[PDB]
């Protein structure tokens, strides 16, 4: 037994010193001795801290002049010799495995555990024993792992190959030598001896372990942790505590991809007859299962037998050797990650995995029990812990101990200067180690006791826990919630430094609308009070970076009048001019109290002070100052835009709107995809940059914002001159930002200020050269500015070129042929378009204003209303110019009326491309309007909206694709509309589902969400008492619709899974009378129930007969079904009865298998003849017609209903007629009618005497 190298062990004191050695922890990283936690018999329930591995000479001398003082050439030099060290370290280390080492040799040594090398630092002193300078693990190098190593026995003296591990002392190549204990042992954390490296009458004996194989990654680690689940049925079992006993058990979780849970790993050993044996689970190797988290073995023999948990080690008969399904030869050693089953080694108690759970009194619960019985006769591949997670999650629990260490404590008394050293270097480690860098960490704050230890040491060591709370919560929004009882803290907090700021800022721009917002009025006291007390105005800056939505404004408004008593800004500011310039000059210098000291009023006050962009009279009218001259930093552009939402607000309704457009755009040759392209998924550059060669080989006072625009074209100019200067370095986000703010309202500036008779097009062909003279790795960085300018750039030229571009030579030039000219070059419509012009007034309409929005405005709904019958006169986006300032709220109280102008359901197509980019917007304002709404218009009114959108063509009905939420409006509206019924007259609840739910007009065009989609639903009323009205009707409906398909088996009974043989009864169980409570109906909601109830069985009939589900409807339903057949001329019938004719159908046709039940077809050919239907075509079609159909067996009509045969005479009578019935007239052309009625006499006439 010779050791080896990359083969590695534990080793132990001689003499009196012998202790085993074990890492302390991230929190801890001190070398503890423990004469009394263990022996060489017995190493510990978890030897596994201090596993370590000898290594060779990692070599860091280039690192060495790195890391000494660790320009900027340097720094990439120094750095080079990193990279080529470190990785240089991989080739040697990995290749080393199996050399065989003497003695003096030296040879540097990790660490299994914490893959850390011994470090040996001769110029600081150890903190335990003062004259052993510094023994510390340094995992990147150091000097100190690297030793001479020294003979200790004297027959393995020098120059033999180390056998059996000798007992032998090694030195670093750094202090000098032997190793040495001492009486050390500590008070706060004792049990563990001192380790030393000083002059010394000690002894170390090697203890053998991981090999040259060693790990060997091709069979199960014998030590590493490991999941456990199935193939057959994941039985991942896990070891949890319920009801204050210990539970261990396996179940279901509401594992193969992604991360499973953290109480799963579980630690291995590998059965040894000595501490330290090396292995690995092997055939025979034997088999040993630890709990990790508590350290216990699991103990596994009866209930017959079942698993029960050992809690201390070295216990044989908690051992278990496998079993394994699949057997394979390359490897007797047991494969890694391979399925593999397992049963006690000690009691005759096989192992077994299954759906029974051992947990009782709980629900879908954590335990499916599966426990070791006799048997013999699953699926299991062992799975084990990652060593990235392990060191991670490592990391969060010292951390914690850290941190409940210190808070305690400090709730206790004074922190202490040495101990004051670690806690401090504790959290900013943990800044260090935050690194939005990936999930397992930073859910290990949360999980770990990283955020709870913080969270109990919350009551310099600040700007530790906010760093790593920022880093680690880009997608946790729980610490909101720590301001309704944390905020109380913050105030103390709010006088030490602005650091909550960062908080508050990460928190303003990913959470808006309602975050604190009664904080808002709080906001004002805190931003002059935060402004006064910062002197720097910290808390208030913050505050104008959130900016927001809209609800900053009304409440965060306020703190401005505020501002002026408080702000008191009364030094050094006028000129009015000249004196602004010399303030440039003064301030221009960048080596102190000059650039700096300006800056901070100067980016602050022109970000926020753009500020209010919409509303013009608080920003346009205060902003009377807007007069600045060779601006920078692209406030202007922002500024102008709130002058600017005052008027302009003048939107856009497409280009192309009529036949003639598509002809132009056909003319055109395309190009908007061209454009399209690498503005819409552009992503990285280069996407655009395709766009952009294809075009470089290419061919040759409105208003008081024109004089601006002069100035305006001439920057432009002078940023086509800096253009003409082509360069790549700084400075491109003060001109691409100036140019950015600029661009975007470029496009806006050309939009809604331009010049006709060629003037803006004039204005036009300069913007070409201006636009043709304009300007990936770090450019990801760079390239959100960047992507800023290739979207303005797109944004000028698609309001110019797709707004209002390229229009006029057909308009303009024209022929005027034949019919006496016709060139250019509604009936009284031009009058209806002042109204118009009363919509652009309503647009721009500001609230809590006397004039004239109580009575006058009044809502011209039947004007706008009324306007039916006619074509999408190119407006309608036009149209839906209007529709869109009216989404601030649609709870006013008379709204509707207003928008009951809207109605005009006459063209769904043109309107419907415009409602496209709010359909999902749609969706939401339904999801908090339509989930209880109907202040209630916008339920109503997305009522009228799927009803419209419905019959609005297929791809539209099956585009939303579902992701789009659908069982959140069936959960959600499930809960508040199962409680709630809607009944006639005029049932509310018939078009939220239903008039969507119409399957595409005749119907069904696919049933998408007809089997995983109807995953659960609300209940329909029932049981005690009776069911509901008008809900019976679409409800019936609806259940054929919830699932129904055939493609798929799963509709029959996903729209009546329940019934099977008793549906029946809940029809025959009062259907009128449900009908009449709610309405006063009755016989209505039967009958209209009995339209929808029908068709289940001749339509979507693959939605029935597919799947075998006939025990009990097959002879006992045929008769019972008849069960209340006495209506007459039942137009709610009608659907039902006289649909059944035609709407509800199938019984003849759909059974011919069972015979077994006789003399139905008598009543009912009675009953056809009674209630009657329209002339002729529709009296046969009601009753002959469905003989024709029908007729095709010939054999089993005669086999049953003994003379049944009555239809036979509508074919002399029913069949034909004159023109209707009698001579009324109505069909003028029959030859399709008829001609298809000779062709079924043909299809049908083909097949009687032998069927098909």
């Keep these: 037994s010779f050791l080896h190298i990359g083969d590695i062990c534990s080793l132990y004191?001689?003499?009196?010193?012998?202790?085993?050695?074990?890492?302390?922890?991230?929190?801890?990283?001190?070398?503890?001795?423990?004469?009394?936690?263990?022996?060489?018999?017995?190493?510990?329930?978890?030897?596994?801290?201090?596993?370590?591995?000898?290594?060779?000479?990692?070599?860091?001398?280039?690192?060495?002049?790195?890391?000494?003082?660790?320009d900027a050439v340097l720094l990439n030099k120094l750095h080079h010799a990193a990279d080529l060290e470190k990785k240089q370290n991989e080739t040697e280390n990995r290749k080393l495995l199996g050399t065989v080492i003497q003695y003096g040799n030296v040879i540097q040594l990790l660490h299994l555990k914490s893959n850390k090398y011994l470090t040996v630092n001769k110029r600081l002193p150890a903190l335990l024993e003062k004259?052993?300078?510094?023994?510390?693990?340094?995992?990147?190098?150091?000097?100190?792992?690297?030793?001479?190593?020294?003979?200790?026995?004297?027959?393995?003296?020098?120059?033999?190959?180390?056998?059996?591990?000798?007992?032998?002392?090694?030195?670093?190549?750094?202090?000098?030598?032997p190793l040495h204990a001492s009486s050390h042992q500590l008070v706060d954390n004792p049990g563990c001896n001192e380790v030393n490296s000083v002059n010394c009458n000690t002894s170390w004996k090697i203890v053998l372990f991981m090999k040259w194989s060693d790990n060997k990654d091709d069979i199960l680690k014998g030590g590493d942790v490991v999941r456990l689940f199935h193939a057959e049925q994941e039985k991942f079992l896990t070891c949890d505590e319920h009801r204050k006993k210990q539970h261990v058990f396996l179940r279901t979780t509401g594992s193969a991809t992604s991360a499973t849970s953290s109480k799963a790993l579980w630690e291995v050993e590998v059965v040894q007859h000595d501490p330290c044996r090396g292995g690995a689970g092997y055939w025979?190797?034997?088999?040993?299962?630890?709990?990790?988290?508590?350290?216990?073995?699991?103990?596994?023999?009866?209930?017959?037998?079942?698993?029960?948990?050992?809690?201390?080690?070295?216990?044989?008969?908690?051992?278990?050797?496998?079993?394994?399904?699949?057997?394979?030869?390359?490897?007797?050693?047991?494969?890694?990650?391979?399925?593999v089953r397992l049963r006690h080694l000690c009691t005759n108690t096989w192992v077994h995995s299954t759906n029974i759970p051992i947990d009782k009194?709980?629900?879908?619960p954590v335990m499916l029990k599966i426990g070791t019985s006799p048997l013999k006769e699953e699926a299991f591949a062992i799975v084990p812990v990652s060593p990235a997670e392990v060191r991670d999650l490592d990391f969060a629990n010292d951390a914690s101990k850290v941190l409940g260490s210190i808070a305690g404590k400090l709730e206790k008394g004074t922190i202490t200067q040495n101990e004051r050293r670690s806690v401090t270097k504790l959290l900013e480690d943990l800044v260090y180690f935050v690194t939005k860098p990936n999930r397992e960490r930073q859910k290990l704050m949360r999980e770990q006791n990283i955020l709870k230890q913080i969270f109990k040491l919350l009551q310099h060591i600040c700007r530790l826990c906010y760093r790593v709370l920022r880093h680690s919560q880009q997608d946790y929004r729980k610490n909101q919630e720590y301001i309704a009882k944390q905020f109380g803290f913050m105030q103390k907090q709010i006088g030490y430094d602005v650091l909550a700021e960062d908080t508050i800022t990460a928190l303003l721009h990913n959470n808006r609308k309602l975050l604190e917002k009664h904080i808002t009025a709080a906001e004002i006291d805190t931003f002059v009070s935060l402004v006064r007390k910062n002197r720097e105005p910290r808390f208030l800056d913050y505050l104008s970076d959130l900016c927001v939505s809209m609800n900053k404004s009304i409440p965060v408004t306020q703190e401005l009048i505020c501002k002026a008593v408080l702000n008191p800004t009364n030094a050094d500011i006028l000129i009015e001019t000249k004196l602004v310039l010399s303030r440039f000059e003064f301030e221009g210098v960048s080596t102190g109290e000059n650039a700096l000291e300006a800056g901070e009023d100067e980016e602050e006050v022109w970000l926020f002070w753009r500020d209010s962009n919409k509303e013009i009279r608080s920003k346009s009218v205060r902003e009377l100052a807007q007069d600045a001259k060779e601006g920078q930093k692209e406030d202007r552009d922002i500024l102008s835009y709130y002058r600017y939402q005052l008027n302009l607000f003048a939107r856009m309704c497409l280009d192309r709107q009529y036949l003639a457009i598509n002809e132009i755009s056909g003319q055109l040759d395309v190009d908007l995809i061209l454009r399209c392209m690498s503005d819409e998924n552009l992503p990285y550059d280069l996407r655009a940059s395709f766009c952009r060669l294809m075009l470089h080989m290419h061919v040759d006072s409105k208003d008081?914002?024109?004089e601006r625009f002069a100035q305006t074209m001439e920057f432009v100019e002078e940023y086509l001159r800096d253009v003409v200067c082509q360069r790549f370095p700084f400075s491109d986000k003060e001109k691409n930002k100036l140019t950015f703010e600029v661009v975007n309202l470029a496009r806006n500036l050309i939009y809604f200020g331009f010049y006709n008779f060629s003037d803006l097009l004039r204005l036009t062909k300069i913007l070409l050269a201006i636009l043709d003279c304009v300007h990936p790795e770090k450019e990801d960085i760079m390239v959100m500015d960047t992507k800023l300018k290739i979207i303005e750039i797109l944004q000028f030229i698609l309001n110019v070129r797709l707004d209002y571009r390229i229009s006029c030579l057909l308009c303009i030039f024209k022929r005027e042929f034949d019919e006496s000219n016709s060139q250019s070059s509604g009936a009284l419509d031009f009058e209806h378009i002042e109204e118009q012009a009363e919509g652009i007034f309503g647009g721009s309409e500001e609230n809590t204003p006397l004039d004239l929005d109580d009575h006058g405005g009044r809502t011209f709904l039947r004007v706008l209303l009324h306007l039916t019958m006619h074509d999408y006169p190119p407006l309608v986006s036009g149209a839906l110019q209007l529709l869109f300032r009216h989404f601030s709220q649609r709870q006013e109280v008379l709204q509707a009326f207003k928008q009951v102008q809207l109605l005009v359901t006459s063209?769904?197509?043109?309107?419907?491309?415009?409602?496209?980019?709010?359909?999902?917007?749609?969706?939401?304002?339904?999801?908090?309007?339509?989930?209880?709404?109907?202040?209630?218009?916008?339920?109503?009114?997305?009522?009228?909206?799927?009803?419209?959108?419905?019959?609005?063509?297929?791809?539209?009905?099956?585009?939303?694709?579902?992701?789009?939420?659908?069982?959140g409006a069936h959960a959600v509206v499930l809960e508040l509309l199962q409680i709630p019924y809607e009944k006639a007259e005029?049932?509310?609840?018939?078009?939220?589902?239903?008039?969507?739910?119409?399957?595409?007009?005749?119907?069904?065009?696919?049933?998408?969400?007809?089997?995983?989609?109807?995953?659960?639903?609300?209940?329909?009323?029932?049981?005690?008492?009776?069911?509901?009205?008008?809900?019976?009707?679409?409800?019936?409906?609806?259940?054929?619709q919830l699932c129904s398909e055939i493609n798929e088996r799963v509709v029959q009974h996903f729209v009546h899974c329940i019934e099977t043989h008793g549906r029946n009864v809940q029809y025959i169980k009062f259907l009128q009378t449900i009908v009449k409570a709610e309405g006063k109906f009755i016989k209505k909601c039967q009958d209209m129930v009995m339209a929808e109830l029908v068709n289940s069985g001749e339509d979507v009939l693959v939605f029935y007969n597919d799947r075998a589900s006939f025990q009990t409807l097959i002879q006992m339903m045929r008769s019972e079904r008849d069960r209340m057949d006495e209506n007459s001329p039942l137009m709610y019938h009608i659907h039902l009865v006289e649909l059944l004719a035609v709407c509800t159908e199938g019984k003849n046709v759909y059974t011919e298998i069972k015979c077994n039940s006789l003399l139905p077809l008598d009543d009912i050919v009675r009953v056809v003849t009674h209630e009657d239907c329209i002339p002729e075509v529709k009296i046969a079609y009601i009753n002959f017609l469905n003989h024709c159909y029908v007729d095709t067996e010939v054999e089993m009509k005669e086999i049953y209903t003994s003379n049944h045969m009555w239809k036979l005479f509508e074919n002399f009578l029913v069949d034909i007629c004159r023109a209707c019935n009698n001579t009324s007239d109505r069909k003028h052309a029959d030859s399709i009618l008829e001609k298809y009625v000779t062709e079924i006499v043909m299809s049908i006439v083909t097949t009687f005497f032998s069927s098909p």
């Design 284 to 339: 025979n190797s034997l088999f040993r299962f630890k709990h990790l988290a508590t350290g216990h073995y699991l103990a596994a023999e009866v209930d017959v037998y079942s698993l029960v948990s050992v809690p201390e080690g070295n216990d044989i008969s908690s051992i278990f050797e496998l079993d394994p399904t699949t057997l394979r030869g390359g490897d007797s050693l047991v494969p890694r990650n391979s399925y």
């Design 907 to 967: 063209q769904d197509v043109d309107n419907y491309k415009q409602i496209k980019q709010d359909l999902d917007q749609l969706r939401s304002i339904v999801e908090k309007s339509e989930l209880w709404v109907y202040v209630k218009e916008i339920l109503i009114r997305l009522s009228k909206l799927c009803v419209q959108e419905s019959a609005s063509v297929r791809k539209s009905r099956k585009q939303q694709q579902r992701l789009l939420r659908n069982m």
């Design 704 to 706: 008081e914002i024109k």
């Design 986 to 1040: 005029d049932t509310k609840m018939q078009e939220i589902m239903r008039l969507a739910h119409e399957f595409l007009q005749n119907f069904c065009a696919g049933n998408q969400q007809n089997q995983a989609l109807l995953h659960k639903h609300i209940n329909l009323f029932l049981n005690p008492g009776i069911l509901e009205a008008v809900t019976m009707q679409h409800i019936f409906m609806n259940n054929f």
């Design 131 to 177: 004259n052993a300078m510094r023994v510390t693990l340094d995992e990147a190098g150091n000097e100190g792992s690297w030793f001479y190593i020294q003979p200790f026995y004297k027959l393995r003296s020098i120059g033999d190959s180390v056998v059996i591990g000798d007992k032998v002392v090694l030195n670093p190549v750094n202090a000098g030598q």
């Design 13 to 70: 004191a001689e003499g009196s010193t012998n202790g085993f050695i074990s890492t302390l922890g991230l929190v801890d990283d001190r070398c503890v001795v423990q004469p009394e936690a263990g022996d060489l018999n017995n190493p510990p329930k978890k030897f596994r801290d201090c596993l370590f591995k000898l290594c060779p000479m990692n070599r860091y001398s280039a690192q060495k002049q790195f890391w000494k003082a660790a």
């Design 361 to 364: 009194e709980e629900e879908k």
